[PDB]
Amino acid sequence: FTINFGPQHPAAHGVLRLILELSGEXXXXXXXXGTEKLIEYKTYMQALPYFDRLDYVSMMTNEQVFSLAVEKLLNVLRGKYIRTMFGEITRVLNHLMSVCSHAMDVGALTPFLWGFEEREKLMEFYERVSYVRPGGVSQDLPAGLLDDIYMWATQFGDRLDEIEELLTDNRIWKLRTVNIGTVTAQDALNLGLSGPMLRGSGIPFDIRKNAPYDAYDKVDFDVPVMNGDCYDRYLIRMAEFRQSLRIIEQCCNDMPAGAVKVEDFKINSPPRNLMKEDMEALIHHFLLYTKGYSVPPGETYTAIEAPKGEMGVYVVSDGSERPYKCKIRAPGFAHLGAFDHIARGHFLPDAVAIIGTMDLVFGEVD
Amino acid sequence: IINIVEILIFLVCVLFSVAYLTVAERKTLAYMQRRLGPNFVGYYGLLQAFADAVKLLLXXXXXXXXXXXXXXXXXXXXXXXXXXXXXXXXXXXXXXXXXXXXXXXXXXXXXXXXXXXXXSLLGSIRSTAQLISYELILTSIFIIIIMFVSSLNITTIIXXXXXXXXXXXXXXXXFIASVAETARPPFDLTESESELVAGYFTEXXXXXXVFFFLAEYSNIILISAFNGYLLLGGXXXXXXXXXXXXXXXXXXXXXXXXXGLINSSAYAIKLVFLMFSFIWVRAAXXXXXXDNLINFCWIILLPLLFGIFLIIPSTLYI
Amino acid sequence: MYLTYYFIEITIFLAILCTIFIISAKNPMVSILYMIALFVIAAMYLYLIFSLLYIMIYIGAIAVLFLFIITLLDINSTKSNIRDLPLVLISLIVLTISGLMIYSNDSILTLLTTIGNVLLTNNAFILLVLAIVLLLGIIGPISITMKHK
Amino acid sequence: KPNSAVDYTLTTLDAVANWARQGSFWPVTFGLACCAVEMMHVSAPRYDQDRIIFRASPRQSDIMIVAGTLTNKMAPVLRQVYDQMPEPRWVISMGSCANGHFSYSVVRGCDRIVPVDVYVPGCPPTSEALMYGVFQLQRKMRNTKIT
Amino acid sequence: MFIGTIILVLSFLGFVFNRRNIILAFICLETMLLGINLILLRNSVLFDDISGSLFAIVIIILAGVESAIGLSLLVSYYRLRGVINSYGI
Ligand code: SF4
């Protein structure tokens, strides 16, 4: 006697074969069914188009992570500001989707529509640019970058509050979330529960702070904080939305004239106009796009905070044009191992709410 | 004979409105969400009701989970019960308010039947229970309004009401909280869908769905209208009827027309507003978690109204 | 005039059939539906208010309870000396009569039906007892199916 | 094909239902990866197309939109949903993955398991391109389609 | 009263001959109660005023109680899950 969750429309998409054993209110026997292999057979530059494919909503977190680790292995400002801006923009796009998705999953539609309008403003900022590369970035933004983010940053802080205005003063959502979704902080650490799912439960360990990457050190970010539940994980992400918007404002301000990718010819490739004057640039251009570059023989793993948890690329390089083995530390897979424990004894309609709060995407998991 | 045209027109109208109301909820909610509902299917968007309800019948689609012909029978009873409730409005019926109570008693029977897969049927029993709770609530309220009145005929209540939703504002608020709880925010979540079961609504299958939603919205227009006669303003500008409203009628001239219309336009306005409340309550909405709806009514709303029975006659004998 | 009204003894004809159908029906659910229809025929016979009382309560609640119980509780169903034993007693029924016919040969060669007046008033002792009888109704199960700690 | 055929151009009855069909078309959402995310931008931009959820049964909808990567394991499930759909049914293949990143864990094409009416390339294709595919299915239901 | 009497009879017959079943019984009894109510109602109308109408209503209330009692009796019987005691019965 079980409930086979899905098999296509559980409440949104995914796919799901969450064979939920039940007895009223019991045993989550999931089944999460070769990117790991395909990446091996692909050059470092080629793995960029593959990278964004995993977590589609916060694709840039995937890009940054991978690009960073590859940078560290290889040893490669106004470009680092663009990343901090884009990482947070993709964090706003990824936070919007999840808040709404979960607001839709158990409860009503309405917030989801609003979520999507601001998303359409970011996808427009995504079509305008395309973006991240191992040297830096594909190309420069535009003169219409500065004045456009402000129009989005002004007509967002209000909008961020209407979604909150409805949810903070939770109608049924308070009765449905408040106790549900048991996450002991010790046991979250024992189950390796990534977080923003971990920081709501009380523990204050986030990669952006513990191990700050490019331009995140120089930017002023606030302290988002009670009891490991769906409601408090849901609300922390709403505060995270406003602090992200404050990073976007703070990073839009600190944007002067600069180059976009690492000048070392063996890495990147920024000629575009120089293809007509230099010989070393074509011999290089042809070679980078045919063979590529061979990194140093050794292991590397650089972690980056995604809005869906802990993103890390474990790249073993055997001095080849391609990575010898690229194992992506899956935030959504790590978080899901705590479902059989968190949803144990919980309700069936709440078993949908307990899943949306985890902030999962199947593309990242598998 | 003459009555055949009087019944026909009315029912054709009722059905017309039922069909359009689907498109209404659509457009209204889209306005809330900053979007537009059925943009083309019109002109206006009038032909989204028809061209859709025509498309489910043309599909013309059955699993042993529900007995052969009992599978497409609850679809018939849900509509047949809704048919009676509208027809029982037009006619006077000397004992009318406990004729309205006979139909909402008999409507629910189709839910217990609907699924009678083991577990899906279990899910049906939940809704069966859920409905049963608020159906008891409404009766408690019907009864309170009869306490104030004593005359069981619906008409006497409709006509009796220079006040209606002034004393009974709290009661009416509780009526809408139950009137919606019988079908919209909870039932939308009470559907559950675990897994597939039952898509958007009760395994539709086509074209039984056409009579289902034509018992849903139909028994939302009648469910709100019913609330209107009992609790709300069941026709006319009463402040004017107190201030000497006759002026406009007496100075109008003579035709025996527009006087019969005024009231219908007022009731139309009432149901329109109640429907809008229904439009937004579906928007604002959150969870239901069946046990978290059983707890709400049995332990709270039900004993709240009980205490009211221990006030109405006491303050009547005061 | 109005012959159909005169022939509405059609109620009895229907009823006998509808109950012979509650018996014949395999299995319970159809029989439940049947009890509803039979009660509906009874209501149609009350137009010949007790229909509306009968429809609101019997069909309204009882029937709902029978349908809600059958769908909840799996139960169901469809000569070994003791089974033969009742039939043994009926062959004695025939014998009594057969012995008797041979015995006689010994010397031979505003307000609408109301009800409230008497219930709330004269029979208030009963109305009070009916509040107490309903008490048990709800309490009995709460002390038969509970299993509390 | 044939032009103004029969005694009197009617013809009317079939086209009446077909016009009603094409614009009221019921889509069954089969969300897999990124393509399901673009297909949601589609609903934000939908007005007449609006019907998703009819996707959950799935016996209530006519238009099967396969959006995302079809894993070889997912292959027998996608087969049973299309078979568990009602008879006048259409299929829209959304995405490079559902049309034709070719791996060892994914089906090389969605047409291999279920017959495909309209193909929409892109990675993921823009919302308007799915609308164009929706119109490619609209003009197809109308008997419009040819070379 | 003619109708109600016939209904009562049928109900009684169905009661015993039991028809093995055991499930039908409660339905049958409820039917019997209805039948009687019918007989009395005709008699009340024959007589006039609150003579039988009240007793009628009572049996109705009482019938409700009986169905409650019977249904909880069934819920009580039919103990759930397959756990065994040890030699005591
Ligand atoms: S490189 Fe060109 S050919 Fe390859 S995917 Fe990019 S677009 Fe297609």
Ligand code: SF4
């Ligand atoms: S590829 Fe080599 S030989 Fe061919 S022209 Fe270029 S650099 Fe000189």
Ligand code: SF4
């Ligand atoms: S097509 Fe591109 S968009 Fe759809 S799943 Fe495949 S990878 Fe994603």
